[PDB]
Enzyme design. Structure first.
Site, PDB file in Angstrom:
ATOM      1  N   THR A   1       0.822  -1.200   0.000  1.00 48.92           N
ATOM      2  CA  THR A   1       0.000   0.000   0.000  1.00 48.92           C
ATOM      3  C   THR A   1       0.886   1.294   0.000  1.00 48.92           C
ATOM      4  OG1 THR A   1      -0.324  -0.191   2.429  1.00 48.92           O
ATOM      5  CG2 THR A   1      -2.117  -1.001   1.022  1.00 48.92           C
TER       6      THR A   1
ATOM      7  N   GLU B   1       2.211   4.786   1.379  1.00 46.35           N
ATOM      8  CA  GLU B   1       2.230   5.395   2.735  1.00 46.35           C
ATOM      9  C   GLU B   1       1.078   6.355   2.876  1.00 46.35           C
ATOM     10  OE1 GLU B   1       4.323   5.266   5.457  1.00 46.35           O
ATOM     11  OE2 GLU B   1       5.437   3.557   4.675  1.00 46.35           O
TER      12      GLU B   1
ATOM     13  N   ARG C   1       8.141  -7.570  12.439  1.00 44.43           N
ATOM     14  CA  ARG C   1       6.734  -7.704  12.165  1.00 44.43           C
ATOM     15  C   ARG C   1       6.389  -9.118  11.815  1.00 44.43           C
ATOM     16  NH1 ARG C   1       6.412  -2.756   7.838  1.00 44.43           N
ATOM     17  NH2 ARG C   1       7.664  -4.392   6.905  1.00 44.43           N
TER      18      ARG C   1
HETATM   19  C1  THP Z   1       5.818  -7.877   2.943  1.00 43.74           C
HETATM   20  C2  THP Z   1       7.268  -8.056   3.389  1.00 43.74           C
HETATM   21  C3  THP Z   1       8.093  -7.000   3.668  1.00 43.74           C
HETATM   22  N1  THP Z   1       9.398  -7.216   4.077  1.00 43.74           N
HETATM   23  C4  THP Z   1      10.325  -6.085   4.292  1.00 43.74           C
HETATM   24  C5  THP Z   1      10.971  -5.723   2.974  1.00 43.74           C
HETATM   25  C6  THP Z   1      11.244  -4.253   3.078  1.00 43.74           C
HETATM   26  O1  THP Z   1      12.569  -4.164   3.659  1.00 43.74           O
HETATM   27  P1  THP Z   1      13.515  -2.866   3.205  1.00 43.74           P
HETATM   28  O2  THP Z   1      12.610  -1.685   3.478  1.00 43.74           O
HETATM   29  O3  THP Z   1      14.512  -2.914   4.338  1.00 43.74           O
HETATM   30  O4  THP Z   1      13.899  -3.136   1.800  1.00 43.74           O
HETATM   31  C7  THP Z   1      10.134  -3.759   4.025  1.00 43.74           C
HETATM   32  C8  THP Z   1       8.981  -3.099   3.313  1.00 43.74           C
HETATM   33  O5  THP Z   1       8.001  -2.721   4.335  1.00 43.74           O
HETATM   34  P2  THP Z   1       6.893  -1.606   4.132  1.00 43.74           P
HETATM   35  O6  THP Z   1       6.332  -1.659   2.769  1.00 43.74           O
HETATM   36  O7  THP Z   1       5.948  -1.731   5.311  1.00 43.74           O
HETATM   37  O8  THP Z   1       7.780  -0.401   4.171  1.00 43.74           O
HETATM   38  O9  THP Z   1       9.684  -4.932   4.710  1.00 43.74           O
HETATM   39  C9  THP Z   1       9.920  -8.515   4.158  1.00 43.74           C
HETATM   40  O10 THP Z   1      11.118  -8.731   4.545  1.00 43.74           O
HETATM   41  N2  THP Z   1       9.130  -9.582   3.916  1.00 43.74           N
HETATM   42  C10 THP Z   1       7.861  -9.412   3.486  1.00 43.74           C
HETATM   43  O11 THP Z   1       7.144 -10.419   3.238  1.00 43.74           O
HETATM   44 CA    CA Z   2       3.715   0.160   2.276  1.00 47.13          CA
END
Ligand code: THP
Ligand code: CA
Length: 130
Positions: free
Chosen positions: A35, A37, A75
């Site tokens: 999504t 921000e 998370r």
């Molecule tokens: C959905 C998802 C996000 N992430 C990580 C990748 C991105 O890391 P980097 O930002 O460090 O590249 C970040 C994106 O989160 P958001 O889209 O909430 O920002 O969360 C995973 O590691 N596994 C996942 O399945």
């Molecule tokens: Ca996002």
């Protein structure tokens, strides 16, 4: 896969929700989606859609996939269902999220999400409207 119960603590934004899971608060990031921000175009709309879905549900369920269960930001990584409807799919079908972060270890519902996206694009919804 299997569904597990949980209870809502708070909706955070379009693709993150804090839930009480096995008696402890966890922030869940929705698998297979991205999504905007809140500060970006469609960000408030995506936030609102996820919020309404989870707040209005009597029954919230967590469905982990078959691979990693938490990310580098601590998370939980799951499919979230609200009264039997998958939030991850619904967001994409409305054009409020793109299919993203598709890692092979956790890709069970990839085809389902891409099918939703293709239809949101045909219908020129939200992020796809131009
Ligand atoms: C959905 C998802 C996000 N992430 C990580 C990748 C991105 O890391 P980097 O930002 O460090 O590249 C970040 C994106 O989160 P958001 O889209 O909430 O920002 O969360 C995973 O590691 N596994 C996942 O399945
Ligand atoms: Ca996002």
């Amino acid at each position: 896969l299997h569904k597990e119960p949980a209870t809502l603590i708070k909706a955070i934004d379009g693709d993150t929700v804090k839930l009480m899971y096995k008696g402890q608060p966890m922030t869940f990031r929705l698998l297979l989606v991205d999504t905007p921000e809140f500060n970006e175009k469609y960000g408030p709309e995506a936030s609102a859609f996820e919020k309404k879905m989870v707040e209005n549900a009597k029954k919230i369920e967590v469905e982990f996939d078959k691979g990693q269960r938490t990310d580098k930001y601590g998370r939980g990584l799951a499919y979230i269902y609200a009264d039997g409807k998958m939030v991850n799919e619904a967001l994409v079908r409305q054009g409020l999220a793109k299919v993203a972060y598709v890692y092979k270890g956790n890709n069970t519902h990839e085809q389902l999400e891409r099918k939703a996206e293709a239809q949101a694009k045909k219908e020129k919804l939200n992020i796809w409207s131009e």
